[PDB]
Each structure stands twice: as C-alpha cells, then as structure tokens.
Amino acid sequence: GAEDLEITKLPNGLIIASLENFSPASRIGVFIKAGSRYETTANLGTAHLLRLASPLTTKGASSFRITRGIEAVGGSLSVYSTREKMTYCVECLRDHVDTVMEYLLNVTTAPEFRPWEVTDLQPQLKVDKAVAFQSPQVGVLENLHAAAYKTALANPLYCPDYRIGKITSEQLHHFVQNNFTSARMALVGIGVKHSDLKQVAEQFLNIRSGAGTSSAKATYWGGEIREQNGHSLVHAAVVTEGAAVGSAEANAFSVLQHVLGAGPLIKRGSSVTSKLYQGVAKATTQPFDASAFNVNYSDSGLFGFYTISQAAHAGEVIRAAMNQLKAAAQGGVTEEDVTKAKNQLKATYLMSVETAQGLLNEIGSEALLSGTHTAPSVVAQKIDSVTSADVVNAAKKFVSGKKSMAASGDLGSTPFLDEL
Template sequence: MGCRRRSQKRITERKSGPEREPQKRDFIPSKLLPKLKPQLPLQERLHILRTLSDILMEFLLNVTTAPEFRRWEVAALQPQLRIDKAVAFQNPQAHVIENLHAAAYRNALANSLYCPDYRIGKVTPDELHDYVQNHFTSARMALIGLGVSHPVLKQVAEQFLNMRGGLGLSGAKTKYRGGEIREQNGDSLVHAALVAESAAAGSAEANAFSVLQHVLGAGPHVKRGSNATSSLYQAVAKGIHQPFDVSAFNASYSDSGLFGIYTISQAAAAGDVIKAAYNQVKTVAQGNLSNTDVQVAKNKLKAGYLMSVESSEGFLDEVGSQALVAGSYVPPSTVLQQIDSVADADVINAAKKFVSGRKSMAASGNLGHTPFVDEL
C-alpha cells in the first residue's frame, strides 16, 4: 500500500467506516459501506451518498485492479503477519479449524488462511503482483452494489474491470483425502472436530446437510448459552456430568464441504463426549428422526438465513457469494423454498453419508483420553 493508498484508506475510513474484509477460503471480499449519522435529514444523507459514490468507487477499483506493493512497505508489514496469527490462534477453535482443513484435503482447501511461519519476511512485491495478475481477472470478479442503478454498475464494470480478461490461472480441483492432526499441549480443555466430506455449496445435498446441522444443534444463539435443548447436547449430557459443549459443524465451499461434530470438554471426558455425540448422529442415520424435528430444524435454518441478510453487509456477502460460486443470484424467497423442499429422507441420507464417509479429525489439548480417528 503506497502513500496514495494510505490516504485513500484514511478517507475511506473517515467517510465509510473501516473496510471489513473477513477471511474466506473461497474468495476475497472488498467492501465499502458508507456510514452516515442517522440524525441527518434523509435528503441530506442521500445527497452525501451520491456525492461520495464516485470517490469511493475509485478507491475500490484501485484496490482491486491496480494495487501498489512498494518494497519498503511490504517489508514493514510482514512482522504484523506474525502478530495477527498469534492473536488469532489464542482462540483454540481457530487453530483446530485450520488443522482440520489441512488434514481433510490434499490441496486447495488445505491451504491455511494464515501465512506459514517460514514464509513470513520472505514475501516479495513481485510475488504479490504476480498473484494479482493471474487471479484478479474479470472472469473471477463479481461487482455487487446496493442502492446503485444497474446501468451505472454495469458501466463501471465494463470500463474498469476488463483490464485483465480471461480466467487467469486455473486452480487445482479440491481433493478430499481424510486424515488426522493432533496437537498435544497443556490446555485443560480438549477441542476436537470430527468430520467427513459433505456437499458443495448451492446443491440440494448441501441444503440437506444444513437442515441436519440444525436437527443436531448448530450452536447457541445466546451469549454464553449452552444450547441445552439440542439433540447432541442432550445425548452427551446423559452420561457426562462435567462441563462440555458440543455442536454440529458444517462448512460448504464451491467444490466440496465438510460436515461433522465439534466438541469442547475436560481432558478426562474427551473420549466419552466425542463418542456420545458421534453415536447421536448414527441414531439419525438409522432413521430415528421425526418429521416434527425436521420442520423445527428447517424453521431455525430459515430464520438464521433471513437474519443474516437483514443488514446491508450481510446481504452483500450473500449476493457476492452466490455470484462467485454459482454465477447467478437466487433471492431469499427461492432459498426458503429450497430449504422447504428438503425431505426427511434427504436428512437421513446426509447423516448416513457422514457416518459411512472417510473421516478427518483435528484435536488440541491434553489428548491422553482423546480417541484417534480410526478408533471411532
């Protein structure tokens, strides 16, 4: 980021709030979300937004199509990578999820979201330019706008986003392999994830796995909640009297997906918690699932989806994800219909696929009582 880029970022933060670019495994988002004081009259806010739109669009296009990587600035930024990684891995879940993908996949999705230690300090501006040249191509981009007329957005795309045409370098197709990574340390709590390959995002099978996730328990929606009403929690609680947490894990990508269980428990009870949760999924796979449970899970899934697209930022994420993965946009009403179309048998088949599939596992903590993946 050169001096010009720094000034752009300052202006952007002052006028729009900081750019939030959450890390994704499938794509890199760049967003500008103008934030204006709500006490301003509506007409004044609209005037300001129209005035700023051209300025902010210029910043966004410069960042995505003509980034500058000056050597002294790239060198100065690299120590921050080590700090960011250390901060992220203070949360054991972040490390376990990274290890889970490394164990599950042979390539592509196995790549970490974080720079490996041996590369920190060695990334060059030439490498960054080469990456942008080969990956930031028009066929790989989606330009999404809210409150902007389609002709204006189309004109911007045709004028500025066609400088690098084509598909760029073809990425390797994701290969699921199954595997296990165990990280022994002195933590009193054991974090463990057990998964199998599920389905790619946007498919009917992926919808079935999403419903199954909510049948089992997708995690608490209340801060510090225990999700005690979920079937996974209740199944584990029958034999475990120490504190624990358990939820279904579900991640869908453009060409693959992972589904399974995530547990947090005391070291001595880790094996019992994991096995009890796994047995509960087996129970569903054997057909022990009522239509009422499926309907409740569908309602939870639909409510969660609708709440995720209530905000402008969430809606931008959803439209952009669909555009990049499927090449088209499906409105919320259609998404709800797709969820409703999932049959009880589809959910049972999803559970069967997990139970019979090749497993991947990642665990962290004092693992003396944590089973290996082949013992499950």
C-alpha cells in the same frame, strides 16, 4: 422506496449486482475467486499477505491518501476472505460513494506492491496471526483442512511461520494478475443505483478478461492431526466429506445440521432441540459444548461435529457426539425434528441478512458463483423440500465415509479416529 435487484454481466464476464434500499449508507464490494486454495507450496501465505496489503500504495492513490482519503469522509475499507473467496468492500454515507470508490477500484486493480512497503508489512503477518490464534477455535480448523485434504483446501488461511518475510512483490503481483480477472470478479453494491455501479465497473475496472490459474481439485485425505499443548479444554472436530456449494445434497446436510444442533438460541439456556447437545449432555457432567459442523466449498465440503470439553471428559463427550450421529443415521429422526430444523434454518437464513454486511455478502456470493439471485421464496422452497429420508441419508454418509479428525489441548484422554 422498495423494489428490485438488477444484475448485469458485462462483455468480459464481470458480474455487477445492485440493490437500492435507500439506506442512508452505502456498501460497495468486489468479490473475487481467490484464496489460500490457489496457493502452491512455493508461494504459501501470499494470499494472507495480500489481505494485509490492502492499504499499500497503488498506481492511482498513495498509501497515505488511501487511508486519509477514506477516513476523511467517515468511510471504511476492509478485506474478508475464506480459502477460496476474497472480498474488498467499503462503506460510507451515500454522498461519498464516488470518493470511496476510487480507492476501492485502485486497491483491487492497481496495486504496486513496492518492495520496501511490502518488506515492512510482512512482520505484521506474525501479529495478525497471533491475535487470531487466541481462539483455539481457529487452530483446529486450520489443522482440520490439513487433515481433511492433500491439497488446495488443505492450505492454511494464515501464512505459515517459515514463510513470514519471504513472500515477494513478484508473488503478490503474479497472484493478483493470475486470479483477479474479470471473469472471477463481481462488483456488488447495496445502497446504490444499478446504472451508476455499472458505469463504474466499465470505464475503470482495467484488469480485463481471463480465468487465469485454476485451483487443483480438492483431493480428500482423511487424516488425523492431534495437538498436545496442555490447555485444560480440548477442542475436537470430526468430519467427513460433505456436500459442496450449489449441491442438491447441500440443503440435506444443512438441515441435518440444525437437527443435530448448530448453536444456542437461548442465552445461557440448554439446547433441547439439539440432539447432539442433549446427547452429550446425558454423557458428561461437567461443562462442555458440541455443535454440528458444516462447510460447503466450490468442489467439496466437510460435515461433522465440533466439541469443546474438559480434558478428562473428551472421551465420553466425543463418543456421545458419535453415538448421536449413528443413532440419527439409523432413522433416529422424527418427521417433526425435520420440521423444526427447517424453520430454524429459514429463520437463521432470514435473520442473517438484516446486516448491511450480511446482505451484501448474500447478494454477491451468488452473483459470483452463479450470476443470478435465487429469490428468498425459492431458497425456502428448496429447503423444506427435503425429506426425512434425505436427512437420515446424510447421516449415513457420515457414519460410513472416511473420517478426518483434528484435536488440540491435553489430549491425554482424547480418543484416536480409529477408536470411534
């Protein structure tokens, strides 16, 4: 028991990934190319509401049966999503896959979006959004993408306020009809045999072929959105256009990430291997945090740093975070730093797959934006195959490129993008 990872690709462009690891539990999923990215000023938040609508009645199963049915076999059903991808997955013990599958299939391909059900559901965007925004972390990221873009990616991941209660069954339907198309969907599935997961995708996945609505290109703006709100702690993020998914310059940044520092590895411990952390450390005296921020999207990406700090020290802390990026673009990168990083990155990657969830995510992410499974050795080969120069170049691209900044808290002492 240990081998393979088959992956068919039906007539309509619907990719099917599969891996049997004989786990006592299965986890099937439907990855899709959809999100606030394909929203227009006209239907904003419709993707968010769609996310919360997963439990509404479908043409095959009712709101009631979905929840009762899944819970009956100790299953689960959830929808995770970024600005450009939406995953509908379910978990359960091996012996119930066929049962949980029905609802999964129904939810993604047969929604009904009954007006009343939809009307009652909307006041929920208000809640859902309120708990998310408890983390300042999420607020600035929203504004970041809004300051870093003029469209598509500039769209918020959480339905804007003015639109709560105004989304319509039409919009939900159109959004689904124009995006949930066989050529934009992948039916991944850990803990199952490939023939089985395939026979399913066939006889049942109705909404056939297409590519429907195509997202507008990700135009880069380079703006600065600031939020004065009193908070004793100031969260700031300064980024630049970075590499995109499947980009050669990607692996470069990812490595520059770890070199600068991307999250602690030792509990309550200091990060010495983190140039950025250590840099800021020598600058401020009070508590703070600083990390390398790095996002890779389909046709774009963002790269820079993120910093949490006491209001009166945001100045010194952000500058320090900068000087440490310039110092790195001017060849301030040892050949060893590049070696350490490469390991942290490989390990980080490798650990980030022990989770059933993490693995399924990994597998399906490829089978959707590719149709193939890059072997672990290959991804390893691609990572270390990054010169010390590539890294100092990535750094350069940042110190040079047009920067966009998003900050929030008591900005009374926070610098403006043009003072960096």
